[PDB]
């Protein structure tokens, strides 16, 4: 990793890049989620920006996945209750 130019080419604000990559790295580090790109024993920050460069992560997809994996948890709870 040297430059983050295409990670700004795909998220034009350059400040939303930091929020999306921080949210992604916090999901990968403590929450225990797998990276969507195969790593090379990089740290979670570079894996976050490496997922940004592929395009498969931004704030839209992160909100989609948090709503679907919150509805999945509450659906599992409701089907366990009733």
């Amino acid at each position: 990793r040297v430059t983050v130019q295409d990670a700004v080419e795909k998220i034009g604000n350059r400040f939303d890049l930091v929020l999306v990559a921080a949210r992604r790295a916090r999901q990968m580090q403590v929450g225990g989620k797998d990276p969507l790109v195969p790593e090379e024993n990089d740290k979670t920050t570079v894996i976050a920006l490496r997922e940004i460069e592929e395009g498969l992560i931004n704030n839209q997809i992160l909100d989609v996945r948090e709503r679907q994996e919150q509805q999945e948890q509450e659906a599992a709870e409701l089907q366990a209750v009733t």
């Binding site: 990793r1 024993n41 990089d42 740290k43 920050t45």
Partner: protein, 51 residues
């Protein structure tokens, strides 16, 4: 004690982790920059010349 295994730990924690270098009279905003360290036998900070 600095035993023989902690240098491997240190090469595994430096790897993708920036530091901030700072010259003491910071005049403009290029006076604070961020690098990725390389371990040096010695006691000085080797700093790229163009920078």
């Amino acid at each position: 004690r600095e035993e023989a295994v902690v240098w491997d730990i240190l090469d595994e924690v430096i790897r993708e982790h920036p530091v901030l270098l700072n010259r003491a009279p910071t005049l403009h905003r290029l006076g604070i920059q961020a690098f990725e360290p390389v371990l040096i036998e010695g006691k000085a900070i080797q700093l790229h010349p163009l920078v």
